[PDB]
Each structure stands twice: as structure tokens, then as C-alpha cells.
Amino acid sequence: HMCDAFVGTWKLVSSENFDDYMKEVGVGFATRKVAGMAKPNMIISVNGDVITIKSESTFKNTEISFILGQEFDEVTADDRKVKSTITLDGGVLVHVQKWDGKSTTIKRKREDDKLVVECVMKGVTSTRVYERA
């Protein structure tokens, strides 16, 4: 019953500062432009201890499945090959991605009827808000 409030199908409704976040990550011009247009649907489900987060968009489709606290390999939408670990901290899903001596953290939380995603790379934050589809 851990992540019950996250489960469902969600659609992106707003984004702030995502271009600056992508720049800080190292994403190149053309990928930033295309990725920045996309309005992904995020599909979250749970089966036993395994959480699956799918992103379906016009830019890229991705899917990760994981157990909390247990590191996994992830290929991101912008084609980084990262090592990821996702934990639950006070009701917030905290997703750390490590690659090439770099790190970024993506936090997902329920706020009212929204699912709010905060993406941080060094001093740069982007906030992405999803609503139920």
C-alpha cells in the first residue's frame, strides 16, 4: 500500500525551468528543443515490491521497474546510461541518477490532485506538474 497515491495514469500540465535543468545536465540543443515540447503521460503501477514508472511521449518512451533501495541500470530519455536508486522518504519518491561522476535527483510527490516532479541538477531546479489523465 506504499505508493498507492502515486498509482495511475498522469499527464504533464505545466513545466518551469526544464530547459535550464536540461542544460545543467548536459543535454544538447536539438534534444532540449524536442524534449521540451513533449507532454508525457506517466503511468505508475505497483505489483508486490516492484514499482514500474512508464513515460509515453512524442519524444521518447521509457520504462523503469525497480525495488525501493536497490540500484538499477537506466537509460534516460536523453540517452544517458545511469545508475539509479529510488527510495521513499517521508512519502516522497526520491530518484538519484549517477553517471560520469555527475548526479541528479528527481523527487515525485502528491500535492492536492497533482503529482509534482522536482528535478535538481546542482543549483538548478525544474518543477513539472502532472494531473490525472
Ligand X SMILES: C=CCn1c(S)nnc1OCc1ccccc1
- Residues near ligand X, by CB under 6 A: 22, 25, 27, 35, 40, 76-78, 106, 117, 119, 128
Q: Three-state SS for 38?
A: coil
Length of the chain, in residues = 133
Considering the complex, state which of residue 46 and residue 64 has its C-beta at the smaller distance from ligand X: 64
Min. distance of Cβ 15 from ligand X in angstroms? 8
Show the cell assigned to 59. 519524444
Q: How far is the CB of 62 from ligand X (least distance, A)?
A: 7
* Residue closer to ligand X (CB basis): 35 or 86: 35
Q: Known binding site for a fatty acid: residues?
A: 128-130
Torsions phi, psi of 96, nearest 5?
-105, 130
Q: Which is nearer to ligand X, 25 or 93 (CB)?
A: 25
Whose cell is 515525485? That residue is 108
Nearest-approach distance from CB 5 to ligand X, in angstroms: 17
Question: Per the annotation, where are the binding residues?
Answer: 128-130
CA 93-95-97 angle, 5° bins: 180
The SS3 of residue 89 is strand
